[PDB]
């Protein structure tokens, strides 16, 4: 009846005004997320505001999230947008109808992004992109995707889409059904930070500050230590997308993760439109309600990092 259809209203009371109250249960992370959102969507920058809200609309409509799409179209109407643009993708100019190919790959199959897509986007012509103008759009798209995943995962109540998307039946296909991404040849901390800082400094600083808030988040009722099962869930979700760590022994994944949680993670990440209440209740039956939110936050961070690393590797291969 209140904020979330899954978390009971009494729990929320004891522990876009709905997402903000369901995510507020971990204060040290909310501040960082709001800072990044304010930078990405409100502060002046290389792209116009209306274009930014349209990008948000396009990104949120991949996973079919009504909440975000409604909020962002409401915001877009009041910043000076063209009402004609809301009839479909085919009415927008031929500079936003180029991001529509990288959209699918970043949302569904990150491992297929190559340098030819970047070259197609930056090729000389009558409607081109600059590097800053495009590095902002990439981060915006990833942010909207992860937000949609979390919103569906926690089951948030309120208070068309088929016209904003091309190839509506792409979806996700399992990885094993392509070379493996060794997580020591291209690491965020050593490689991606520097590039994203040179091309877009403030965003890089804010993302690095947001990555370190989802690491120092303790688990109250575990029963080894908190640092172990966190590593397990993080490595599992990275391995789903095609990244394998060299130092980690992958056997402990089963010995540390119940088989019920392993399905909730995959459902909420890969196909977030099919998550339901029974799934939410199957795993961790006798545990506190403020941990099934921490799991969602970890998942969101992991998806963001995987997509960003793939895109940055593509850009670096293009520029070398």
């Amino acid at each position: 009846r209140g904020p979330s259809a899954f978390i009971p209203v009494e729990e929320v009371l004891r522990e876009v005004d709905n997402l903000a109250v369901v995510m507020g249960l971990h204060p040290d992370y909310f501040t960082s997320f709001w800072r990044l959102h304010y930078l990405l969507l409100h502060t002046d920058g290389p792209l116009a505001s209306s274009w930014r809200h349209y990008i948000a609309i396009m990104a949120a409509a991949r996973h079919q999230c009504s909440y975000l799409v409604g909020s962002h179209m409401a915001e877009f109407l009041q910043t000076g947008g063209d009402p004609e643009w809301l009839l479909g993708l085919h009415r927008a100019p031929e500079k936003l109808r180029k991001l529509s190919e990288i959209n699918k790959l970043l949302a569904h199959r990150p491992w297929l992004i190559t340098k030819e897509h970047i070259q197609a986007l930056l090729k000389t012509g009558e409607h081109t992109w600059s590097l800053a103008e495009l590095i902002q759009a990439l981060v915006l798209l990833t942010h909207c995707h992860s937000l949609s995943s979390f919103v569906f995962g926690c089951g948030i109540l309120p208070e068309d889409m088929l016209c904003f998307v091309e190839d509506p039946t792409f979806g996700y296909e399992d990885f094993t059904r392509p070379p493996t991404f060794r997580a020591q040849d291209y690491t965020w901390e050593d490689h991606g930070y520097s590039l994203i800082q040179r091309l877009y400094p403030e965003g890089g600083q804010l993302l690095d500050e947001k990555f370190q808030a989802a690491y120092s988040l303790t688990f109250n009722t575990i029963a080894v230590d908190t640092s172990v099962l966190r590593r397990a869930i993080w490595n599992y979700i990275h391995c789903v997308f095609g990244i394998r760590y060299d130092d980690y022994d992958y056997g402990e994944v089963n010995q540390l993760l119940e088989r019920n949680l392993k399905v909730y993670i995959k459902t909420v990440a890969c196909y977030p439109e099919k998550t339901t209440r029974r799934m939410y209740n199957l795993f961790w039956r006798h545990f506190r309600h403020s941990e099934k939110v921490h799991v969602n936050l970890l998942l969101l961070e992991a998806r963001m990092q995987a997509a960003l690393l793939y895109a940055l590797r593509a850009i670096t291969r293009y520029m070398t």
């Binding site: 290389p46 116009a48 600059s130 590097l131 800053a132 040179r198 091309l199």
Partner: protein, 304 residues
């Protein structure tokens, strides 16, 4: 005439000095990755009013913009970037950053006011790019429009300051590479209103030694164009359109002076386009003028 010294307080060499549109402010950039702005008081003394770190490498050039758009400055650096600064009510803030280059960016130049708010940059890889700001009320939204590609390494660019409606926009770009071969070092590109693209127009074959700076002349009344080049010597050219693709020009030569017996580094015209100033390796500034018989004499030798 009279020479007065200024205490710059720069920790390394100074690479550029620029005046403003109303003639009472000045900007200096150095290799200590800094930019300084100077003002002139009623007593006629220059004193600094701002200084701030601008890039992470050596800053080569700094240029002003028209006072219709505000107090705006642009810079280029060894770290392959270009920045736009504005003064708000008094410190200077950063508005944009252009990072498409793969090598060092060498020169930056603002377009004449009647085209809008445009910027042109040149690199050491041979690529010249032209940007634009479609909405003057936000100085943080630039968009790439055109991209030329020369065959050699660029060192300097210059716009045509003519304001006539019978002249199409043009830009001249020069090279500086020393090669054992003999290839043309100066090229001119022109805009085509029908095809909406910049196209090659002429090539200055005679120039073969490395170039260091070029500069068009302020038109104000004429039907042809004047160009100045700073190679090993001082050269002045003339381009006159022929009566009516790229327009056809008749290129001639009107002056050549080896009076520096050194290498010429800089050139600068005056506000009316009648006197040319040149600087060389000896350390002296020389002034050139033309009489009614079209002969170019010397007018003065200024020594530091």
């Amino acid at each position: 005439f009279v020479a007065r010294s200024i205490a710059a307080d720069h920790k390394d060499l100074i690479h550029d000095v620029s005046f403003d549109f109303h003639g009472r402010r000045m900007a200096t950039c150095s290799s200590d990755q800094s930019v300084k702005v100077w003002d002139k008081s009623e007593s006629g003394d220059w004193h600094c009013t701002a200084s701030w770190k601008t890039h992470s490498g050596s800053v080569w050039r700094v240029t002003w913009a028209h006072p219709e758009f505000g107090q705006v400055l642009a810079s280029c650096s060894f770290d392959r970037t270009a920045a736009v600064w504005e003064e708000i009510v008094s410190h200077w803030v950063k508005r944009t950053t252009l990072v498409d280059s793969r090598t060092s960016v060498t020169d930056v130049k603002f377009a004449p006011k009647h085209m809008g708010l445009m910027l042109a940059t040149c690199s050491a890889d041979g690529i010249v790019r032209i940007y634009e700001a479609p909405d003057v009320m936000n100085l943080s939204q630039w968009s790439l429009q055109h991209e030329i590609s020369c065959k050699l390494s660029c060192s300097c660019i210059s716009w045509n300051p003519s304001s006539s409606r019978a002249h199409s926009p043009m830009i001249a770009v020069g090279s500086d590479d020393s090669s054992p071969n003999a290839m043309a070092k100066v090229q001119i590109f022109e805009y085509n209103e029908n095809t909406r693209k910049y196209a090659k127009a002429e090539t200055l074959m005679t120039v073969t030694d490395p170039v260091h700076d070029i500069a068009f002349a302020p038109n104000l009344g004429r039907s042809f164009h004047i160009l100045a080049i700073a190679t090993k010597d001082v050269r002045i050219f003339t381009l006159k359109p022929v009566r009516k693709g790229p327009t056809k020009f008749e290129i001639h030569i009107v002056a050549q002076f080896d009076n520096h017996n050194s290498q010429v580094w800089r050139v600068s015209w005056n506000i009316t386009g009648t006197v040319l100033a040149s600087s060389g390796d000896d350390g002296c500034v020389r002034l050139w003028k033309a009489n009614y018989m079209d002969n170019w004499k010397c007018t003065g030798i200024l020594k530091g």
